[PDB]
C-alpha cells in the first residue's frame, strides 16, 4: 500500500525565514489530492490543497500537475510564532460525493527560535 513519509521530526527556523516541509508518497494508487494541515483533529487548519484554493505563501517544491510525481514537499514563506505547530502531509482518496482522508505522515514539528 501507499505510505506517506515526512523524513523530518523537528524543523527549527528563524522568524522571517522560509521553511521546507518535506513529504514523500511511495505509490500513486489510489488517486486523489494531497493536502497539508497544521494540527491533527477536527480542529486542524488547512495549509495547502493540490486540487483547489489559493494559499498565497505556500509553494510546492516539485510540480504537482504532472502524473508520475511523488514529491509533496512545501515551502512556507515568512514563518513567525503564529505558524508554530505540527504539520501533517495527508493523502485523500476518490472524490464522489467528497474527498476522503486515506493516509497521513507522522508529522513535522515546526518552531521558531527567539
Amino acid at each position: 500500500e501507499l505510505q506517506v513519509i515526512q523524513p523530518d521530526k523537528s524543523v527549527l527556523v528563524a522568524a522571517g525565514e522560509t521553511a521546507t516541509l518535506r513529504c514523500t508518497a511511495t505509490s500513486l494508487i489510489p488517486v486523489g489530492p494531497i493536502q497539508w494541515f497544521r494540527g491533527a483533529g477536527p480542529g486542524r487548519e488547512l495549509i495547502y490543497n493540490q486540487k483547489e484554493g489559493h494559499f498565497p505563501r505556500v509553494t510546492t517544491v516539485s510540480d504537482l500537475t504532472k502524473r508520475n510525481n511523488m514529491d509533496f514537499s512545501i515551502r512556507i514563506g515568512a514563518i513567525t510564532p503564529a505558524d508554530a505547530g505540527t504539520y501533517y502531509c495527508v493523502k485523500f482518496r476518490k472524490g464522489s460525493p467528497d474527498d476522503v482522508e486515506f493516509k497521513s505522515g507522522a508529522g513535522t514539528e515546526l518552531s521558531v527560535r527567539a
Partner: antibody
Amino acid sequence: DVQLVESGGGVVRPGESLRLSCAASGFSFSSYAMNWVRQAPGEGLEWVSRINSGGGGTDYAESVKGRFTISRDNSENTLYLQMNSLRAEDTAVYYCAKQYDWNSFFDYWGLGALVTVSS
Amino acid sequence: ETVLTQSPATLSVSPGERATLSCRASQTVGSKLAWHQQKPGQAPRLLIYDATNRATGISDRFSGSGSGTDFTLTISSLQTEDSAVYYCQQYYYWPPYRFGGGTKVEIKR
C-alpha cells in the same frame, strides 16, 4: 470577483434567536477560515467568532460564549452564525470576513447585516 | 496578547496635504501588519498588507512603511472621500483577529 453577502438580519426581541447567513462566491469557500466581526453603533470593530476550513474548529469571543454558534456548509459555499439568548448589547452590524491564510489578516469583508434587538 | 497602539486618535489634514497615521506594537510584529479603511456606514476594506503591499485595486495614494514595532500609513493627496476610520491588524502572533483602537481622519479647516 470575491463576493461576501450577508442576510437574515432585522429586528429581534431579547431572548429570541436569529441565524445570520453569509453567501460566498468568486473563490474556493472550503479552503479558507471564515470569521464574523461585529460593530455596535459608533464603536470599534469586535471579533465575534472564527471557523475552520473543515468546519470542526471554532473560536468565540467571551462576550458571546455559550450563546453563539458558528458553522458552515462547504457544499453550498455558506457561513452561518446562530445567535441564541440575544440581548440588547448584541445590537450591531455583523460582518462575515475571509482570511488570506489560516493565521492571517482579513482578505475581504461582507456588506454587513444590521441586527437590532429591542422589545 | 500583543498590544497595538494606533495613534493619534483623530487626525486633521487640510485638503491636498499628506496624512500620516501611526500604529505601534508592544513587541515586534515583523512585517505582518495590515491596514483597513472604514468609511462611515460602510464595511471595511483592506488597503495594505505585509506592512508595505497594496491590495488589488487600491490607489497609489495609500502607502505603508516600517518593520518590527513602528508602522505608518501615508495618504498622499487627501480627498474628502478619505474621511474614514483606519484600523491596524497584526498576524505575527496567534491570534490575528484583534484590531488597534483606530484613527479617525477628518478634513482640517
